[PDB]
Design a protein around this ligand. Structure first.
Ligand SMILES: Cc1ncc(COP(=O)(O)O)c(/C=N/OCCC(=O)O)c1O
Ligand SMILES: Cc1ncc(COP(=O)(O)O)c(/C=N/OCCC(=O)O)c1O
Ligand SMILES: [Mg+2]
Ligand SMILES: [Mg+2]
Lengths: 279, 279
């Protein structure tokens, strides 16, 4: 439906054409900031309390105080959906280190609320590469995506559409923008527990998997366990559950969505529908 | 002298009050960008070709094309000094991933040239802490200073004014904003060779040290070598050569500037004076 006309900067609704920051902002000069991103459906941001809790935790880890309490931020978000006259959207929160006197020391953070159309996003799982790397402050949703973005050319050149980070080439973590899961041939679901972002999609999938009576192991994953797994999938806000058909030279099954991945995809849609019924 | 009135964005001189970027810029959303920083004295950016070469190398590592060749960028810098009617300044170049369609994929970088007053910056060396950490893409002058800025409260609380990163707590690297050197009791100058930014000040000090006939070892430094060293110092654009009086619970000598550090400080001033004589 309606075109996005407005963002919010520091609690003011602004036309998108005037949504700017002065270049003294620490995100621009020092990549200092946190963010979060969630969808809205039926006029409701999904799992909103979980996202806002993460946003507040992220901010506290950078010693950045959000200038509004959580109920006031929720109001600003809802007000922005209404201003843009949309029920279906992507929503980005950004908290920067602010306009710094010396190009380093935070003084006052800048708060952004941006809004987008829902992601527009055959049988085949996506094809990804392993990449040796460990995200900085990985439990914090920082704005730092240098390595993930710098890798886009390498991902493409190599014939893949995404990656999976492996800490020192040994310990499976996450992609730049997704959590990562395996399903073992006995249907055990396996996902990293440490040095990753605790995705909201990850949380909802794990809960749905356990509520369905699946075994879920949150544990260190050795790179060699890719060869014991039957299925692999990503989770994220914009992907939901997304089947991975190939990692490096390994096709998972015939590369089409595995049994448990398909089940979890439906259960995630169910978690979304259940959440919307509470709004 | 004159107040800073103008920055440059994308080759346009703009009043400082109007130096803004739209919030779709990838530095704001994804911390994607590189920068450089150099002083001007007597109307001349110091060691300018060395800084611009690093800027171009940094850009190539993020696959960001600077929209001007080096001679045209040099012109823009000189034009900005003249516009601001200053001979004495700090100068910041920033190249962001640009206004991205999807908040991730670079499309067109934004180029900023910002300008400042010269840094305003008794006997005693500064007091610093070791911190276990390894900078991401350390040879590249990225805008990513999350850990360095997040550590400001910890540095202060602990009674220090800066830090020295130690890779896995074993291998001495650099501070968030300075290269790091030791001087051993036989007057050997020691500095890391790998996984650090190749500072312009570092380069000028090493050359001056070697031209003076000092032994300079560019090599891995074990954390245990702090106890074999007589002197420690930082190098950076804004510090030049700065004596370190204490690291953790270790006072270097009586904490006042060591012999070789003092010599190198004078030689660096000499490299600056020699450079200005060529302009
Ligand atoms: C590093 C990282 N891990 C995991 C995830 C998955 O977290 P949830 O989305 O499930 O909470 C994300 C998601 N970013 O998504 C941000 C929006 C975007 O990438 O366009 C992420 O950035
Ligand atoms: C990570 C890092 N290492 C070493 C240095 C020293 O490099 P040079 O300055 O000698 O080339 C810097 C300097 N930044 O200085 C940037 C300006 C500032 O921090 O305000 C740095 O950021
Ligand atoms: Mg199939
Ligand atoms: Mg003395």
């Amino acid at each position: 439906g309606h075109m996005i006309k407005y963002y919010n900067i520091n609690g003011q609704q602004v036309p998108v054409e005037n949504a700017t920051l002065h270049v003294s902002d620490l995100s621009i000069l020092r990549g200092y900031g946190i963010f979060d991103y969630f969808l809205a459906r039926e006029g409701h941001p999904l799992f909103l309390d979980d996202y806002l809790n993460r946003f507040y935790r992220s901010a506290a880890e950078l010693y950045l105080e959000i200038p509004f309490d959580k109920a006031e931020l929720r109001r600003q978000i809802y007000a922005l959906l209404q201003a843009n006259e949309v029920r279906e959207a992507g929503i980005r929160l950004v908290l920067t280190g602010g306009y710094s006197p010396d190009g380093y020391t935070p003084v006052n953070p800048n708060l952004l609320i941006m809004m987008y159309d829902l992601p527009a996003s055959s049988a085949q799982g996506i094809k990804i590469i392993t990449h040796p790397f460990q995200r900085e402050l990985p439990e914090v949703k920082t704005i730092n995506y240098s390595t993930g973005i710098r890798m886009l050319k390498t991902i493409k050149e190599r014939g893949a559409t995404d990656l999976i980070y492996v800490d020192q080439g040994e310990w499976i973590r996450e992609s730049a923008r997704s959590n990562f899961f395996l399903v073992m041939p006995d249907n055990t679901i396996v996902t990293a527990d440490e040095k990753i972002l605790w995705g909201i999609t990850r949380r909802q999938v794990i809960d749905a998997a356990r509520e369905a009576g699946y075994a879920v192991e949150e544990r260190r994953i050795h790179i060699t366990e890719l060869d014991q797994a039957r299925e692999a999938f990503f989770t994220s806000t914009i992907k939901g559950v997304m089947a991975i058909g190939q990692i490096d030279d390994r096709v998972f099954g015939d590369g089409t969505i595995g049994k448990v991945t398909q089940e979890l995809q439906d259960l995630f849609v169910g978690k979304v529908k259940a959440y919307l019924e509470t709004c």
